[PDB]
Enzyme design. Structure first.
Site, PDB file in Angstrom:
ATOM      1  CG  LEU A   1      -2.118  -0.947   1.245  1.00  0.00           C
ATOM      2  CD1 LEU A   1      -3.055  -0.635   0.097  1.00  0.00           C
ATOM      3  CD2 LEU A   1      -1.699  -2.408   1.229  1.00  0.00           C
ATOM      4  CG  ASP A   2      -0.739   4.491  -2.076  1.00  0.00           C
ATOM      5  OD1 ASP A   2      -1.442   5.110  -1.250  1.00  0.00           O
ATOM      6  OD2 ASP A   2      -1.208   3.947  -3.098  1.00  0.00           O
ATOM      7  CB  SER A   3       2.156   7.684   1.892  1.00  0.00           C
ATOM      8  OG  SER A   3       3.503   7.307   1.693  1.00  0.00           O
TER       9      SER A   3
END
Ligand SMILES: CCCCCCCCCCC[C@H](O)CC(=O)SCCNC(=O)CCNC(=O)[C@H](O)C(C)(C)COP(=O)(O)O
Ligand SMILES: CCCCCCCCCCCCCC(=O)O
Lengths: 127, 81, 459, 165, 122, 128, 172, 71, 86
Positions: free
Chosen positions: I40-42
């Site tokens: 997952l990204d930020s």
């Protein structure tokens, strides 16, 4: 960004300290030890009238609660303040004053016995 | 107790209004992967919430029954008198 | 009055020879019996002032103040041995001696018959208060405090002395009974105007009036607690009492020159109250509140209305009690924190529930919550002023408003919040201070029950 | 004013208590079937507050509205009365749409509860109060104001249809 | 709001101003009337100390209603026929009031007639 | 766009719309770093005194007494009677003086010319 | 410390979508609009010019602040809610329990005993932790607001007692 | 704690409701309904007016009494 | 409510994160970092952190929103903040 091992070591060290402190916050079987106290025999009788588990006995335990409530909270006022009113307050002029009741035609006054004279016919309107 | 949560595989975005959220947003080129977090809100006994008029309507049937029996009783008494 | 004077004078040898441990106990208890004896002096004839002798007399105005002083004397004794514990026995005995001499001078002042004798003892109260403020003070400007206080008092006192001796030469006697019974109308001569100014400005300096009120925020704030309470509670009442005595021979001129000072107080009571709001120290806030209440008493005096006089006397008594209690509470908190900024120690309501209460009704009485004698004394003056002039009400109406604000503000910012974590010296409430605030508070509500006593000679 | 306002007040307290002390409307929903007793208490509190006929609640307001219609008054003076009744009905149905109606908007942990004798007893006392106390006092007390007889019908019923619109 | 519109938006003199009206004598215009009789008497009027607002021409039904109701306890639902009588009699006096309103209104129309019909001579 | 909320006297510019945090510069970040440094020192020794087991009484705060001395002592020694200072003194301390005196005196004389001419209510004013 | 651009956009996304939750109210609306705004955010991550990226942040913050909710939702216990600082009137400092009268102390005996051993921990840890923070202090004045660790064994980590003995979340 | 208290937490499910409290809720709702319908039938004249409003234009000029409009 | 426990709040968080489509059932783990373990990204991490913010009732501090990554430390901060000690 960042839970670094340098800051980790602090964090779960503080964790085990904080947790053990919270275990300490938990009390113990003797907690709370209560210094010895005298108990009057009347409430010994009343708790023995509460231990048996009968329905009628629980009901009359609470109605005696209500009865002592009545005598020491709602009966002694009608004692003292009535003693104060009828013999001290009402004994002095104009301390107690009541408006004359609304006396309608066709009404009998106790002292005079006369019935207030009736009024003429109503216009006999009808819808 | 241990507070056994129910199995996740019954809290489904299918059978919920979020379908009109999902495919519509699928038409926009994206996808809703947080929907079934709220699936319990649109599933179970919480579903099919009563309408506003239905909300105010609660108890009207028994009230109407009491109305009709009471007026029947008063009709009987006035007929007897 | 020697049934109260002689025991007070003989109280001095008891402390001055008592042992190293018995001075506090003996002084406290015997001052309590002195207050009990003076409680009799509340026995007042219908209209005739009780004339015990030629040089001593009392009426419904002097007797309540005298009872206040005599009942107060044990209170400084109870409030002092906390900050006086670490001292030599001789020095403690002299502190006690200063307090007894102060009370004695106040008794002779209130019971004096000739205006010159009244002036003698009235001003003579300066010396023991000066010693108390200067030597036993703890802050910096205590030395400056003594100079400011003495010089402000004297600058008005001496012209009063000249006016009094001139009156003696002209009228014939300074006796209150003579100058009232043989009172003569005062002509609107400018020499008479200056005579009125001389007879008024000393008491108005000790009132204080707005402007020349700087000796209190620089004197009460600095004095030891005992000196602070004996100053605010009674020494402020000296000017009001003297004015009530002196306006008999100061009419009908007063009204024409009542205009400057009256509003000077009326407007001033606002600013002082506003100054109370933006304060940093508890003691300064209480001092400015005292200035505002005393300014209201000033207005009551210069209205010269029966109702104004009764409300004035009630306000003097109630303000004395409330100010003494508030100063005592401030001293308790300050000693527990060894500082006086009202931000260092906040949120102590939880830590000290009884202090939280004591502060609560101290503020309530300061805020004049009805039917306390503070509220009735204030309201009588408000009604008298409204009869004299309507607009006064809004200014009056402003005052308690702002008063109420600060009347709760310190309580919000000293106990009604969160405690400061780094401080830990706040210990369990020593029952000495709690009891002291009790002896402060219960007489207040007791007099609230029967305010016909503190109602003054006009009742 | 005492009856129905105190009613929906402690009903609001009940819903706050059930949802782990959560107050803002955007964080509960779908509580109609989740709790029928407080739901009934709320919609009957509105049923008295909005003053539909033949219940404690209306036993003043209609006459109140009549009082402002048949009197020497000001255009704004009566305009705010009618518009304020309409506004009152607005959030009266708004709150029932948030809390009990609609879909669940409360946190996942379901602790909505009512099982307490004190709570149910206290609300039901005021339930019977708000259903018949207005009738009791209104039919009882002697007429202290000459009731306004026959009058144009358009301002008689005005109070109800503004609430419903 | 009809007459209100005709007075404010239209002619103020057209509609009866609520204070002075009627501005013409009752005997004038209206066929010779009769001073509205008093069923209630002053002694009975203050014997029940009715409020000055409920001290109207109609108060006989109210005093009878209170006579019955004070004798009717705890039954607060009774004395319905007498209060209905007072409602109808209040309606009768309210009809009298609006009859005065329309009397002033129509006599005001007649006044307008008398004014400008005679003024057309110029 | 919907035009930006111009900062008010009682409400500053929002921290979201601050240009400085957007157009940052190396000296700006430097000026924002050493404040963190000295603040770290200030939290450090405060913690040492605060966590000292033998700490008794109060941790005397120099800043608090600095504020109190500034608002209690320095005000007069640092005061110079500038024209603005004297102007403010005249407008505040003695300004509303004549205003209140005028209004009160006007009411007093206006009413006075109502009693002795008999044009006032005195029927039930036997208490004053 | 310093607010990097990624932080300034993480805060932007947090604020924007929480305000969107306050706006749309209903959960299905919130889901649809939240996914749409997630797309509207991640679509243009590739702004090479940091100045241009900050300008896009200018526009985003401008429009969000113009359209932020006039009553954004805040949970009670959290800063801004109804339960915020509502339990402060119950928490009492730990050192008060050194003040309890011997009767009060003996009426809670073993808790006072474990406070005694925790106090012993504090005494034996104070000198060790002060020399520990001394040896790893940033030379010539602390540099960051961080807190020094207990690298060695058994040493209580420096500046620990008040965090450990902090009044509990629910003192009651 | 409350070990096994009567109300049971239910993770994201409809909670249990003892039939008592629902039946008293419908009791209260049905009672306020029946109350308002019964009083509607008994005293409808209170809410729709005992007597209709006497519109004034329909009144003639005889009972209204104004002198002949052609005087 | 009964005293919340580490594993019960752990159960709530694991259900709500396994519940995510981006977190398929299989790559769920006790050591599941949002960037590296789970991909997952930020932005995605902030979505899941604020979903946590909603379903726990508590509000994450911004100092923890951008930095709370693995469910071990996630449930650990929960344990510390709500005095979860058992
Ligand atoms: C008001 C609401 C309704 C109405 C709403 C109407 C629209 C409002 C604005 C919608 C969002 C806006 O366009 C974009 C913005 O939030 S900011 C500008 C882009 N600037 C960056 O993205 C910074 C550079 N990039 C990174 O910092 C990393 O790539 C990142 C953290 C993003 C990804 O994570 P990675 O793991 O680091
Ligand atoms: C027909 C529905 C809309 C509302 C119409 C107006 C209702 C109020 C009229 C009040 C009139 C008072 C004065 C008379 O005439």
């Amino acid at each position: 960004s960042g839970y670094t091992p340098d800051e980790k070591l602090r964090l779960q060290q503080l964790r085990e300290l904080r947790r053990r402190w919270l275990k300490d916050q938990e009390l113990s079987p003797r907690e709370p030890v209560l210094p010895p106290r005298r108990v009057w025999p009347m409430e010994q009788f009343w708790n023995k009238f509460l231990q048996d588990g009968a329905p009628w006995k629980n009901v009359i335990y609470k109605t005696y609660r209500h009865s002592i409530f009545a005598v020491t909270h709602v009966l002694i006022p009608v004692w003292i303040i009535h003693y104060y009113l009828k013999y001290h307050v009402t004994a002095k002029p104009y301390t107690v004053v009541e408006r004359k009741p609304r006396i309608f035609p066709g009404d009998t006054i106790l002292e005079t016995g006369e019935v207030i004279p009736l009024m003429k016919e109503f216009p006999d309107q009808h819808h | 107790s241990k507070m056994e949560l129910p199995d996740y595989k019954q809290w489904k975005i299918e059978g919920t209004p979020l379908e009109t959220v999902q495919e519509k947003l699928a038409a926009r080129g994206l996808r809703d992967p947080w929907g079934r977090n709220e699936a319990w809100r649109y599933s179970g006994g919480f579903a099919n919430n009563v309408s506003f008029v239905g909300a105010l309507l609660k108890g009207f049937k028994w009230g109407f029954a009491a109305f009709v029996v009471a007026v029947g009783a008063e009709y009987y008494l006035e007929s007897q008198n | 009055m020697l049934k109260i004077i002689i025991p007070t004078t003989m109280l001095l040898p008891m402390t001055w020879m008592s042992k190293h441990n018995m001075i506090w106990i003996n002084a406290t208890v015997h001052s309590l019996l002195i207050s009990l004896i003076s409680l009799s002096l509340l026995n007042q004839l219908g209209e005739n002032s009780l004339n015990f002798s030629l040089t001593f007399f009392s009426d419904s105005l002097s007797a309540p103040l005298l009872v206040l002083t005599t009942w107060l004397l044990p209170l400084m004794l109870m409030a002092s041995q906390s900050h006086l514990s670490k001292e030599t026995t001789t020095r403690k005995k002299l502190y006690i001696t200063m307090l007894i001499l102060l009370q004695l001078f106040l008794i002779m002042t209130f019971t004096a018959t000739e205006l010159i004798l009244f002036y003698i003892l009235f001003e003579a109260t300066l010396v023991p208060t000066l010693i108390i403020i200067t030597r036993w003070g703890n802050q910096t400007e205590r030395l400056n405090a003594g100079l400011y206080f003495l010089f402000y008092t004297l600058a008005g006192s001496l012209p009063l002395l000249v006016a009094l001796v001139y009156i003696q030469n002209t009228t014939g006697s300074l006796n209150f009974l003579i100058i009232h019974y043989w009172s003569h109308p005062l002509s609107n001569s400018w020499s008479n105007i200056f005579m009125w100014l001389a007879c008024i400005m000393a008491f108005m300096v000790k009132m204080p009036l707005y402007g020349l009120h700087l000796w209190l925020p620089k004197a009460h704030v600095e004095a030891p607690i005992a000196g602070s309470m004996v100053l605010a509670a009674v020494l402020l009442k000296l000017g009001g009492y003297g004015m009530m005595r002196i306006t008999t021979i100061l009419n009908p001129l007063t009204n024409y020159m009542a205009y400057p000072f009256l509003m000077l107080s009326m407007w001033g009571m606002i600013m002082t109250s506003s100054i109370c709001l933006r304060q940093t120290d508890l003691k300064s806030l209480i001092a400015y509140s005292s200035v505002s209440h005393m300014a209201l008493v000033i207005v009551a005096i210069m209205i010269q209305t029966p109702w104004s006089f009764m409300g004035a006397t009630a306000l003097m008594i109630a303000h004395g009690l409330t100010s003494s209690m508030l100063f005592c509470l401030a001293n308790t908190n300050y000693e527990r924190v060894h500082s006086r900024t009202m931000i260092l120690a906040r949120g102590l309501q939880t830590l000290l529930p009884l202090m939280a209460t004591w502060w609560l009704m101290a503020s309530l009485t300061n805020l004049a919550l009805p039917p306390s004698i503070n509220l009735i004394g204030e309201l009588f003056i408000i009604t008298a002023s409204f009869s004299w002039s309507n607009i006064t009400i809004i200014l009056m109406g402003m005052n308690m408003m702002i008063t109420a604000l600060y009347s709760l503000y310190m309580l919000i910012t000293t106990q009604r919040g969160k405690y400061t974590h780094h401080i830990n010296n706040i210990k369990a409430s020593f029952t000495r201070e709690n009891a002291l605030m009790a002896l402060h508070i219960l007489p207040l509500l007791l007099l609230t029950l029967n305010p016909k006593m503190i109602l003054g000679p006009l009742y | 004013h005492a009856f129905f306002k105190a009613m929906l007040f402690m009903c609001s307290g009940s819903i706050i208590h059930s949802l782990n002390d959560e107050q803002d409307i955007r964080k509960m929903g779908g509580l109609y079937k989740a709790m029928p007793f407080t739901t009934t208490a709320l919609i009957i509190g509105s049923l008295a507050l909005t003053g539909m006929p033949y219940l404690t609640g209306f036993y003043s307001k209609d006459l109140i509205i009549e009082a402002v219609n048949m009197s020497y008054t000001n255009a704004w003076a009566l305009l705010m009365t009618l518009i304020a009744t309409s506004l009152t009905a607005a959030y009266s149905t708004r709150i029932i749409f948030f809390a009990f109606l609609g879909k669940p908007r409360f946190p996942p942990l379901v602790l909505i509860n009512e099982n307490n004798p004190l709570l149910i007893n206290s609300i039901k006392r005021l339930l019977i109060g708000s259903i018949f106390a207005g009738f009791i006092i209104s039919n009882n007390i002697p007429p202290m104001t000459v009731p306004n007889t026959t009058m144009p019908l358009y301002m008689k019923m005005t109070a109800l249809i503004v609430t419903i619109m | 709001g009809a007459h209100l519109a005709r007075r404010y938006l239209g002619d103020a003199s057209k509609e009866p101003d609520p204070l002075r009206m009627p501005t013409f004598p009752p005997d004038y215009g209206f066929p010779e009337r009769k001073e509205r009789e008093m069923v209630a008497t002053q002694q009975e009027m203050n014997d029940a100390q009715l409020m000055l607002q409920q001290r109207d021409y109609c108060a006989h039904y109210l005093i009878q209603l209170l006579k019955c109701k004070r004798d009717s306890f705890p039954n607060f639902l009774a004395c319905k026929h007498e209060q209905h009588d007072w409602d109808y009699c209040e309606h009768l006096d309210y009809v009298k009031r609006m009859k005065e309103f329309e009397r002033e209104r129509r006599l005001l129309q007649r006044k307008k007639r008398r004014e400008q019909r005679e003024a057309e001579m110029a | 766009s919907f035009p930006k909320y111009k900062p008010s006297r009682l409400a500053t510019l929002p921290a979201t719309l601050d240009p400085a945090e957007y157009d940052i510069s190396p000296e700006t970040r430097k000026a924002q770093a050493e404040r963190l440094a000295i603040r770290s020192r200030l939290k450090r020794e405060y913690l040492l005194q605060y966590n000292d087991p033998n700490r008794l009484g109060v941790i005397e705060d120099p800043a608090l007494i600095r504020w109190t001395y500034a608002r209690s002592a320095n005000i007069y020694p640092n005061f110079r009677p500038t024209p603005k200072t004297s102007l403010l003194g005249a407008l505040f301390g003695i300004g509303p003086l004549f205003f209140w005196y005028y209004v009160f005196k006007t009411d007093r004389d206006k009413k006075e010319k109502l009693i002795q001419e008999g044009k006032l209510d005195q029927t039930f004013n036997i208490s004053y | 410390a310093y607010l990097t651009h990624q932080q300034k956009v993480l805060r932007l996304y947090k604020r924007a979508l929480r305000h969107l939750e306050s706006w749309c109210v209903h959960r299905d609306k919130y889901r649809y609009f939240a996914c749409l705004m997630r797309a509207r955010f991640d679509e243009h991550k590739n702004e090479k010019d940091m100045v241009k990226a900050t300008q896009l942040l200018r526009q985003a913050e401008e429009e969000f602040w113009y359209g932020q909710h006039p009553q954004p939702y805040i949970f009670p216990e959290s800063p801004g809610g109804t339960s915020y600082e509502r339990y402060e009137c119950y928490k009492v400092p730990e050192w008060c329990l050194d003040d309890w009268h011997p009767s009060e102390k003996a009426m809670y005996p073993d808790y006072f005993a474990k406070r005694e051993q925790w106090k012993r921990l504090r005494r034996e840890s104070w000198e060790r932790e002060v020399k520990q923070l001394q040896e790893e202090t940033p030379p010539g004045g602390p540099r960051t607001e961080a807190l020094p660790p207990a690298r060695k064994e058994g040493d209580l980590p420096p500046l620990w007692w008040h965090i450990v003995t902090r009044p509990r979340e629910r003192p009651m | 704690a409350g070990g096994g208290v009567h109300i049971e937490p239910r993770y994201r499910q409809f909670p249990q409701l003892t039939r008592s409290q629902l039946i008293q809720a419908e009791f209260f709702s049905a009672t306020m309904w029946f109350w308002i319908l019964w009083r509607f039938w008994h005293d409808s004249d209170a809410v729709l007016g005992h007597f209709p409003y006497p519109d004034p234009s329909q009144w003639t000029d005889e009972e209204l009494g104004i002198l002949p409009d052609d005087e | 409510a009964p005293p919340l426990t580490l594993e019960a709040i752990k159960d709530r968080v694991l259900y709500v994160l396994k519940l995510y489509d981006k977190i398929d059932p299989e790559k769920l783990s006790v050591n599941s970092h949002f960037m590296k373990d789970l991909g997952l990204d930020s932005l995605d991490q902030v979505e899941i952190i604020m979903a946590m913010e909603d379903e726990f009732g508590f509000e994450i501090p911004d100092i923890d929103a951008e930095k709370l990554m693995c469910p071990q430390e996630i449930v650990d901060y929960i344990a510390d903040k709500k005095d979860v000690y058992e």
